[PDB]
């Protein structure tokens, strides 16, 4: 699925955002998948307009006080 | 070969992390791009505890500063 998807339409990016939710989040449980994480946000956020990503941030700052509240 | 991997090693995720970030980041002037990782990025770090999420959340926000710094300057 993921190696020869190649995305244009908005629903091309949700799936293709599906599958790699579902590749990558296998892996959640793993001793390095948060240093794995850090590196590879950062990576894929660098070309990002500031705003853009400032959404971003938000957003985990959002998570962030969900899982202070839970 | 990303859905073919299956890293155990911290240097599988280093491997897996740089096939993934060189398919991702083709895509960085579409339109819904940055809609994409907003959703992407909140899909992949749900299930990390606080401190984990924490230090993501800082290297975006000194990215971010660094960015404007550059855009400033």
Redesign the interface.
């Known amino acids: ?3 020869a998807m190649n ?4 629903d091309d ?2 799936e ?2 599906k599958l ?2 579902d ?3 296998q ?2 449980k ?1 001793l ?19 705003d ?6 938000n ?3 959002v ?2 006080s969900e ?2 509240k839970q």
């Open positions: 699925g993921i190696d995305p244009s339409s908005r990016f949700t293709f955002g790699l939710k590749k990558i989040t892996y959640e793993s390095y998948y948060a240093s794995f994480l850090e590196v590879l946000v950062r990576d894929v956020c660098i070309s990002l307009e500031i853009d990503l400032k959404k971003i941030t957003s985990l700052t998570l962030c899982k202070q």
